[PDB]
Amino acid sequence: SFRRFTRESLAAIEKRMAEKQARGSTEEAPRPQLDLQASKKLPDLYGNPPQELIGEPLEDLDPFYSTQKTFIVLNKGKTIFRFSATNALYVLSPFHPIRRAAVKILVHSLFNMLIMCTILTNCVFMAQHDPPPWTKYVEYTFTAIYTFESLVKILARGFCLHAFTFLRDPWNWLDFSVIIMAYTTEFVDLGNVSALRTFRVLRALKTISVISGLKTIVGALIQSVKKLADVMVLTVFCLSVFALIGLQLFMGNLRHKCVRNFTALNGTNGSVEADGLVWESLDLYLSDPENYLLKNGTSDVLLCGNSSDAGTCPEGYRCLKAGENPDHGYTSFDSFAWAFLALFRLMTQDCWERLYQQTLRSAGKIYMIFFMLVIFLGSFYLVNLILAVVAMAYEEQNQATIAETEEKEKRHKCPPCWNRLAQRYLIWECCPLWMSIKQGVKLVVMDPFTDLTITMCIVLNTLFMALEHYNMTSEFEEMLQVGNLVFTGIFTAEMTFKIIALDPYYYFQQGWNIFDSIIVILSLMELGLSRMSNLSVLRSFRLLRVFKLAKSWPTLNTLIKIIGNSVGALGNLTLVLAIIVFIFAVVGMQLFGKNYSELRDSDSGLLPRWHMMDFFHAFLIIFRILCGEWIETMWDCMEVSGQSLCLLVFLLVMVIGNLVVLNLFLALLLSSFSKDPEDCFTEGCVRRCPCCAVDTTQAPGKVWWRLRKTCYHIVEHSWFETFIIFMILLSSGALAFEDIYLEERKTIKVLLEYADKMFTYVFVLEMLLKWVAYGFKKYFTNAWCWLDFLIVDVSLVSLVANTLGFAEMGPIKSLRTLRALRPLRALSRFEGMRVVVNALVGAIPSIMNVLLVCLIFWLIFSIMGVNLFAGKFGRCINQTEGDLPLNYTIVNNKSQCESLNLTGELYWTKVKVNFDNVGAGYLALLQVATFKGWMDIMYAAVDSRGYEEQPQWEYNLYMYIYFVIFIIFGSFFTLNLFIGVIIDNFNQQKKKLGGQDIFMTEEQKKYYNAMKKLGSKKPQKPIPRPLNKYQGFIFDIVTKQAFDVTIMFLICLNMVTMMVETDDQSPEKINILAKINLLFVAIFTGECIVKLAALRHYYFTNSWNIFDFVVVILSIVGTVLSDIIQKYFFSPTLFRVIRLARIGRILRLIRGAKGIRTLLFALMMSLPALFNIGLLLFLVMFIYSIFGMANFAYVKWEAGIDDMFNFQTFANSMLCLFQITTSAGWDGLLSPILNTGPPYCDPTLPNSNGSRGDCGSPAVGILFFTTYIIISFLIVVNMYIAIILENFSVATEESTEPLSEDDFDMFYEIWEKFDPEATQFIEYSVLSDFADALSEPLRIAKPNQISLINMDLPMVSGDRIHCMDILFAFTKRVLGESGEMDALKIQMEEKFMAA
C-alpha cells in the first residue's frame, strides 16, 4: 500500500500466519472481496490514481486470503496483478532488483504492443506454399522474441516451485512446445520424414491470451457446450435404429444395372460369343466396363431393376447385379458403416436429390414412403431440440449477468486545447453583411415542404438508374447522362447552401450531416475523371444515396441498429470466428497440399476446381463447408489423401463452425431484441323500401315467413353438411383423371363430362338456397362466402360459354385452368383449417414490413450485378461436341465465329440465367441465396472476359468476393430481421388473447391440459407368499438391480450380434448366426415366462409389462415363419418385410435412462400442433399438382425431367412436388421450361392431343415455382416455431414440490398422545406448554401461545377448539395450496371429518 516495506514487518506476519497448525486455531469459503480476479481495473476504495506510488508490491489491504507470501501490483491502468514473493533455490531471493525489473517489464502495456507485432507477422509468412529459403533467418528472429516472452515469466513466477507459478496457469504451457520445436531442429539432425512440422498453427491461438474479451467469450462458449447434453444420445440412438432398418431393405440394391445380352457358352468347355467377340470366363463379361450402358445426357452408369415399378432400359439388354458401387464406390448399403454415413448425409440435408433418385430407381415407387418418414423424424425434431437447449443455455448467462450486476449495484478531452481559438473566431458568421438573406434562407428551409421534395429526389433518382439495360442503342445513354448530372447538382446544391442558415459551429450535430457530406465528397471526387470513358465501375458508389431513405423509415433504422450491434457490440465474437476460419484454412493446406499434382494429365494441364494448393481456394472451400455443402468436396478425398484424416478434419470443422455460427446468430438476435330472422339489413334506408315489412296477417305475408323458417330448418340439419362434404370430396377427386387417359379411354370421358354438369347444377342450387336462408347478412358478416361466390361464378361462365358452342376461343378455353381452384372450397368446412388460417392471417403486416426492406436491399445489389456482369455470358459452340465451349485461338468475338459458320455446325447460345436486366438479376440472386444452382452462375461469372468475348479459364479469380459479400449480407441479416419481426408479432398476438391456446381446436385445447399431469399418490409392492420356499426369494430376485443388469446385458449382446451383417457371405456364418438368433429369442422368451406369478394375474396394467407378451408374440411369429413355410421361399419382398420385426426388442431400453424421456414426452404432447399444419401443406401441394399437370404435360425430357420424374401422370407430379417442397433442388426442374429457341424448340410437333410443341412457357413457370417456394418456407417456419415452443412449455420443474409427506408423523404422534380420550377437542391453555416439545418447531412455541388464538383457532360449543381445524393451518406454515401432497392431506382430513 505504501512506497516500501521493511525486512522485519513481513516476517512479523509470515511467522504468525504459519502458527495455525500449532497455535493459530488451537467456514472461510474464500471469495473475492470485490470480485478481484486479475486483469481487471476494479477501483474499490481509493478511486483515484496515486502520485507515484503505483507499480510496486503491495500488502493486499484485504482479508488474509491472498496475502500469504504473495503481493499485488497495479499498472498505469490500475490493472490488478498477483505475484508470489518466493525464491528459486541457490543464490536467489525476492529481495533483488532483478525481480523488480522483471515486474516492470511484465506489467507495463508496452510488452503487449511488441508481441502483437510478432504474431500477425508470423500469420503472413506461413501463408505461402513455396517460400524462398532465406525465410529460415526470419524464423530465427521469431524464435528469439518468444524466448524473451518466456524468460521474464519463468524468472518472475517460478517454474513449478511454490505457488502461482508459470505452469500453474493452464494457458502458459499451451505454447510451451513453441520453445521446444524451434530448438529441437537446431542441435538434432532431421531425417527424411514429411507430414511433420504442421504444428506452428497452434501458435496463433496465443492471440487469445492477449485480448481478454476473447478469453471471456471462449469461456462462455465452453460453458454452453458443457451445458448441452441429453440430445446427442438420442441422435445416435435414432440414427442407429434407422441404419438397422435400412440395412434390411436396400442391401446390395445399388449395383443393379443392365448389360448387353449374354448369349451362351455354346455347348463346349466354355466360350462367350457375341457379335464375333469371344470371352473366356463369365467374370470377364460381367465385370467388363466396356459392356455397360451409359445414361444419355449425363456421365454415369444407368441403374435398373426387375421390379414391376422399377423401370427398364432399351431392348437388347438384360438387368442383373454386378460390378462396383456407383459414384467412386463411397455410397453403400452393404454394411453398417456406409449406411450410417448415408443417414448422417440425410440428417444434414445435402446432395439428397441424387441419392433419392438412385435409390428410387432400383427400389421402386412404393418405397418412397420410407424417405417421407426419415426426413420428418430426422431433420426437424432433433435440430429443434438442439436449438432449444442452446437457446436456454444462452439465456441463463444473460439472466445471471443481469442479476449479479443488480446485486453489485445494490451494495477533460482537451489534449491540444488550441481549437478553442477557433471557437472564439467562428460562430458569428453573419458578419456586418447579410442580416437579411441569412434569416431568409433559415426560414426558407421548410420542413413540411423542402424535407419532402429532397426525399422525392432520393427516390426518383434511385429508380432512374434502374433503366441501365443492354444495348440501349443510345437515346437512353445520353438521357441517363443528362439526368445523373441534373440529379447530382440538385442533390449537392444545398451542400454548402445550408451553412448560411445553420451556423457551422453547429454544422455537425447528429452525424447524418457527416454522412451527407461524405456522399457529396464522393460524387464530386468521382466526377473528376472526364478525359476518359473507361473505369465505369467508379461511377457505382453513388448507390450509397439509397441509404438516405433511412431517417424517414421505421425499420431501416432497425436494420442499421442490428448492423452496428454485430460489428462493435459483438466484435469480440466475430473476431473469434475469423480466427477459427483462418486457422482451419491454413491447416487444410498443410494437411493435403502435395496430393493434387497428379490430378491434371489432361487438356494441357488444367486443374479441377476447388483445390487446396493456395490460400484463396482454401478460404473458398472452408466457406463452402461452412455453408452446409461438404459431400462434393469430401469425395475428392479418399483418392489421394486416404480415409483416416479427411473424415476427421471435415467432421470437426462441421461441428466447430456450425456451433460458433449458431451461437453468434442467437447472440445477435438477443442483443437486437433487448323467433323471426333478419330480413335484409339494419333499419337504415329500408324506410323507402317497404318491400319485406308488409302486412302478414293475411295470405300475402305468410310466404316469406314460412319460406325463411323452412330454409332455416334445412340448413341447420347435419345430414345436409354430410351431403356437402361427400359431394365436395368427390368433386376434388374427379379431377385427378385428366392425364393422357383422356385420349386412351372413352367411358371415363363421358362419365366426367356428365359429372361436371351435375356438380355445377348442385352447386348453383346451394347458392340459390343460401341467398334465401340467411337473407343478405352473409357476404358482409362472414367473408368466407366471397370465396364461394368467386369460385361458382367461374363454372357458371364456362357452362354458359360451352352451352351455345361459343367456347372455341383461347380466353375461354384457358378458363378451364381455373377449375383447379375447386379444392379450395373445402377449406372452411373443417375446424383445424379455420384455426390455422385465422392464426396465419394475423401476420400480413409483419410480412410486408420485411418484404419492403428486403426488396430495396436486394435491388441495391442487383443494380451492381447488372452494371458489372452484363453482356458477357454468350458463347458459340459445335453441335456434335455437345454444349461445351471452345478454345480462344479459333474464335475470339461473336462476329468472328459467325463469319466462320460455313458448315452450319456452329451455333450461338446464351446462359439461361443472366444479369442482362433487373428482373433476371432478381432471379439470379434468388437462386444464389437459396444455395441451389449457383455453381453454374459463378462458373459464368469467373470465366467472364471483355464485352462480347469468348470466355477463358479462371481469368478473373476475384469475382468470388462479390458473391461472398452478398451471401453474408442477404442471408444472415435478412433471416435475423424476419425471425425477429415474426416472433415478436406472433407473441404479441398470443399475448392479446390471454392464453397460450393457439393452433388448437376446441376439443384439443381442453384435452392437451386434461391428459397431461405429473403427480404420484402411493405406489406399492405386491408379492404373494402362501409358500415361503420359492416366491419369497423370487421377490428378492426381481427387486434387486440385478434384473436391470440382466436386461441391459442381454439387449446389448443382441445389439452386438445384429451388428454383424454384410452382403452374400459364407454359409457357415449364415447358419451359426441363425443359432445365435435362436438362442437370444429363447432366452428372452424364458425371461418373460419366468415372470410368471410374481404379481399373479394383476400385472396387466399401464406399467411396462404387457409389452413382454407383445414382443414374445411378435418375435415368435416372425421367427417360426421360416419353419412354417420351409417348403418354399419365393417372396423376396414379403419375407424381408416380416424379418424387420427384429427391429423391436431394442426400444425396451428407453424404459431406462430417465433423462431420455421428457424430450420424447414433449413430442407426443406436440403432435396435435403439427397435424393441422400437415393437412394444410397437403391441400396446398394437391392444388399445385393439379394446376401443374395442365401445362407441362409434354415438356422435353432434359435435365431433371426423366421417365420416372415428369408431369405426365399424377404420381410423378406428386413425387416431384415432394422433392421440391424442401427446396432440395429446383434449378434442374425449372431449367427445361425456359427453352424457346428453334435449336431447343421444335415448333411443329406431330402430337396426339390438343397441344403443339415440347417446350413450356417461362412466364408461368417462374411464378409457379417462386410462390410454392415462399409458401413452403412460411409453413415450415411456423412448424419450427410450434415445435420449439412446445419444448419450452415442458419446463414446469418444481411446479408443486410438496415434500409435505413427512410432517403428518408428528401430528399423528400427538394424536396418539391425545387418542385414548377420543374427544378430538383441545385447549390452548395446555397446548401452550405441549407445543414446546415440537421437533424443530414449525408452529407456535410457548411464548407464541397468545398468537395461536388469532391464527385459525376457532372456538365452538363450550369454547372448544377442534383438532381438524389445525392440521391444514400447520401444513400451510411450510407449504400449502400448491403441492399434491398438501391437497391429498387436506382431502384425507376432510374425509376423516365425514367419517
Ligand SMILES: *[C@@H]1O[C@H](CO)[C@@H](O[C@@H]2O[C@H](CO)[C@@H](O[C@@H]3O[C@H](CO)[C@@H](O[C@@H]4O[C@H](CO)[C@@H](O[C@@H]5O[C@H](CO)[C@@H](O)[C@H](O)[C@H]5NC(C)=O)[C@H](O)[C@H]4NC(C)=O)[C@H](O)[C@H]3NC(C)=O)[C@H](O)[C@H]2NC(C)=O)[C@H](O)[C@H]1NC(C)=O
Ligand atoms: C430379372 O429377371 C431375370 C430373368 O431373366 C433374372 O435373371 C435370372 O436370375 C437368376 C438368379 O439371380 C439367375 O439364375 C442363374 O442360374 C444359373 C444356372 O443354374 C446359375 O449360374 C451359376 O451362378 C453361380 C453364382 O451364384 C456361379 O458360381 C460362381 O459365379 C461367379 C460369378 O458369376 C463366377 O466366379 C463363377 O461362375 C462361379 N465361381 C467359381 C469359383 O467358379 C456358377 O458358376 C453359375 N453356373 C455356371 C454353370 O456357370 C445361377 O443360379 C444363376 N446365375 C447367376 C445368378 O449369375 C440368372 O441370372 C437368371 N435366370 C436364368 C434361368 O437364367 C434377374 O436376376 C432378375 N433381376 C433381378 C434384379 O433379380
Ligand SMILES: CC(C)CCC[C@@H](C)[C@H]1CC[C@H]2[C@@H]3CC=C4C[C@@H](OC(=O)CCC(=O)O)CC[C@]4(C)[C@H]3CC[C@]12C
Ligand atoms: C484475416 C485478416 C487478419 C487478414 C490477414 C491477411 C494476411 C495474413 C494474408 C492473407 C492473404 C495474404 C496474401 C496472399 C498472396 C500474396 C501474394 C504473394 O506473392 C505472390 O504473388 C506469390 C506468388 C504467386 O502468386 O504464385 C506475396 C504475399 C501475399 C500478398 C500475401 C500476404 C499475406 C496476406 C495478406
Ligand SMILES: CC(C)CCC[C@@H](C)[C@H]1CC[C@H]2[C@@H]3CC=C4C[C@@H](OC(=O)CCC(=O)O)CC[C@]4(C)[C@H]3CC[C@]12C
Ligand atoms: C498439445 C497441447 C499444447 C494442447 C493444449 C490444449 C489444451 C490443453 C488447452 C487448449 C485450450 C484450453 C482451455 C481454454 C479455456 C478453458 C476455460 C477455463 O474456464 C474457467 O476458467 C472456468 C472456471 C474455473 O477456473 O474453474 C478452464 C480451462 C480451459 C477449459 C482450458 C483448458 C486447457 C485447454 C483445453
Ligand SMILES: CC(C)CCC[C@@H](C)[C@H]1CC[C@H]2[C@@H]3CC=C4C[C@@H](OC(=O)CCC(=O)O)CC[C@]4(C)[C@H]3CC[C@]12C
Ligand atoms: C484443432 C485445430 C486448432 C488444429 C487441428 C490440427 C490437426 C488437424 C493436425 C495438426 C498436427 C497434425 C499431425 C501432425 C503429425 C502427424 C504424425 C503422423 O504419423 C504417422 O502416422 C506417420 C507415419 C506412419 O504412417 O507410420 C500422422 C498424422 C499426424 C498425427 C497429424 C494429424 C493431423 C494433425 C493432428
Ligand SMILES: CC(C)CCC[C@@H](C)[C@H]1CC[C@H]2[C@@H]3CC=C4C[C@@H](OC(=O)CCC(=O)O)CC[C@]4(C)[C@H]3CC[C@]12C
Ligand atoms: C455502410 C457502409 C457503406 C459505409 C461506408 C463508409 C464508412 C466506412 C464510413 C464513412 C463515414 C462514416 C460515418 C461518419 C460519421 C459518423 C458519426 C458518428 O457519430 C458519433 O460517433 C456520435 C453519434 C451520436 O451523436 O449519437 C458515428 C459513426 C458515423 C455514422 C460513421 C460510420 C461509418 C461511416 C459511414
Ligand SMILES: CC(C)CCC[C@@H](C)[C@H]1CC[C@H]2[C@@H]3CC=C4C[C@@H](OC(=O)CCC(=O)O)CC[C@]4(C)[C@H]3CC[C@]12C
Ligand atoms: C471482405 C471479407 C469478407 C474478406 C474475407 C477474406 C480475407 C480475410 C482474405 C481472404 C483472401 C484474401 C486475399 C487473397 C489475395 C489477395 C492478393 C492481393 O490482391 C490484389 O492484387 C488486389 C485485389 C483486391 O483489390 O482485393 C491483395 C490482397 C488479397 C486481395 C487478399 C486480401 C485478404 C483476403 C480477401
Ligand SMILES: CC(C)CCC[C@@H](C)[C@H]1CC[C@H]2[C@@H]3CC=C4C[C@@H](OC(=O)CCC(=O)O)CC[C@]4(C)[C@H]3CC[C@]12C
Ligand atoms: C463499394 C461498395 C458500395 C460495394 C462493394 C462491392 C464489391 C464486392 C466490389 C466493388 C468493386 C469490386 C472490384 C472492382 C475491380 C476489381 C479488379 C479485378 O481485377 C481484374 O480485373 C484483373 C484483370 C485485368 O483487368 O487485367 C478483380 C476484381 C475487383 C477487385 C473487384 C472485386 C469486387 C469489388 C470490390
Ligand SMILES: *[C@@H]1O[C@H](CO)[C@@H](O[C@@H]2O[C@H](CO)[C@@H](O)[C@H](O)[C@H]2NC(C)=O)[C@H](O)[C@H]1NC(C)=O
Ligand atoms: C464440329 O464437329 C464436326 C463433327 O465432329 C467436326 O467435323 C469433323 O471433320 C469433318 C469435317 O471437316 C467431318 O467429316 C468429320 O466427321 C468430323 N470429325 C472428325 C474426327 O474429323 C468439325 O471439325 C467440328 N468443328 C467445326 C468448326 O465444324
Ligand SMILES: *[C@@H]1O[C@H](CO)[C@@H](O)[C@H](O)[C@H]1NC(C)=O
Ligand atoms: C477347359 O479349359 C481349361 C483351361 O483352358 C482346362 O484346364 C480344362 O481342363 C478344360 N476342360 C476340359 C478340357 O474338359
Ligand SMILES: *[C@@H]1O[C@H](CO)[C@@H](O)[C@H](O)[C@H]1NC(C)=O
Ligand atoms: C436417351 O435415353 C432415353 C431413355 O429413356 C431414350 O428414350 C432416348 O431415345 C435416348 N436418346 C436417343 C437420341 O436415343
Ligand SMILES: *[C@@H]1O[C@H](CO)[C@@H](O)[C@H](O)[C@H]1NC(C)=O
Ligand atoms: C435379349 O435378352 C432378353 C432376355 O429376356 C430376350 O428377351 C431378348 O430376346 C434378347 N434379345 C435378342 C436380340 O435375342
